[PDB]
Amino acid sequence: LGIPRYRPDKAETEPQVGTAQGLAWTPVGGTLLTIEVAAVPGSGKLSLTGQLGEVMKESAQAALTYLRAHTQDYGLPEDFYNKVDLHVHVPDGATPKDGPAAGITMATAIASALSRRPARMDIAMTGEVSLRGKVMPIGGVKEK
Amino acid sequence: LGIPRYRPDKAETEPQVGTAQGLAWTPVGGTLLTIEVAAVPGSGKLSLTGQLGEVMKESAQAALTYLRAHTQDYGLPEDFYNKVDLHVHVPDGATPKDGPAAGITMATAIASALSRRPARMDIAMTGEVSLRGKVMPIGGVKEKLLAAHQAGIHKIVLPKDNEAQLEELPKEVLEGLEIKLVEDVGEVLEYLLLPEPTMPPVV
């Protein structure tokens, strides 16, 4: 059949810091959404790279807001909202993503980056995180 | 025939600070885009000019973000991010480029500029970058390799996820091109950049 046309994504066993495994429904079937964020010094800013969809622009913000309101719950920096600059990124760097489903992944990715505690990809993330933290149900759960 | 209309792509010999060779496939095939960036002083600000689409905008942002968390890994200044003005220029200002397959090329350019160590223009680059540094594969790499070979480039840098792509590469092209395989940019940034700087950085 010639050279392979696609590269399946595997679960990297070793815990990666600042990255969290995620699941997202898609018409091309099922795929491993990967959420990676950085904790770099700065004056306080949030950027949403990876050609993210407008829908993820408020789910990620709500997750970061929960972490901001729970900074001492998990040893997060007391004043990271003026020092740490948020750079959310999700590959493919140029793929049309949409839907706040499995938004918790971003929350967990940001928590891992902030607290320097790596998140295992042997466990996958699903569900939308509210401002209070309540995880509302989503759709297309079986494929993800 | 008449006057010279176009000019062939030439592999520049002397390594220049703040420059990086690149390969961008076009309707007429891949092209040796000479990525030019700047590290002029000032406040924190990013400039993306040369009809740079968003697919390249977040690519450059991701590369710069990776470099921000890897300061001492490549010798960048410890306080650059607040005090750097980055102006990613791509030839030609008229050409509306598209696609994030030049993530390594733009990253190489900014890396060479920040470290003041000229990158190897004699080598061609291709592949996007993430925040972990893993270089994702691309689509349509044979045209990029073809353009690099025709323009006088004899060394290529390719992501370590693209080994399956080399069998479709043209034969007489492939022997004349040494193929460096990299899992992450942490291998590109010492194979390309000179081990010493030439001109002092911005303080």
UniProtKB/TrEMBL annotation, chain A:
It comes from the Bacteria. Induction: By heat shock. Mg(2+) binds at L23, A101, T126. It is found in: Cytoplasm. Residues 14-144 form the Lon proteolytic domain. The active site is at A101, K144. Homohexamer. Organized in a ring with a central cavity. ATP-dependent serine protease that mediates the selective degradation of mutant and abnormal proteins as well as certain short-lived regulatory proteins. Required for cellular homeostasis and for survival from DNA damage and developmental changes induced by stress. Degrades polypeptides processively to yield small peptide fragments that are 5 to 10 amino acids long. Binds to DNA in a double-stranded, site-specific manner. Belongs to the peptidase S16 family. This is Lon protease. The gene is lonA1. The chain holds residues 578 to 721 of 793 of the full protein.
UniProtKB/TrEMBL annotation, chain B:
Mg(2+) binds at L23, A101, T126. The lineage of its organism: Bacteria, Thermotogati, Deinococcota, Deinococci, Thermales. Homohexamer. Organized in a ring with a central cavity. This is Lon protease. Induction: By heat shock. Belongs to the peptidase S16 family. ATP-dependent serine protease that mediates the selective degradation of mutant and abnormal proteins as well as certain short-lived regulatory proteins. Required for cellular homeostasis and for survival from DNA damage and developmental changes induced by stress. Degrades polypeptides processively to yield small peptide fragments that are 5 to 10 amino acids long. Binds to DNA in a double-stranded, site-specific manner. Residues 14-195 form the Lon proteolytic domain. It is found in: Cytoplasm. It comes from Meiothermus taiwanensis. It comes from the Bacteria. The active site is at A101, K144.
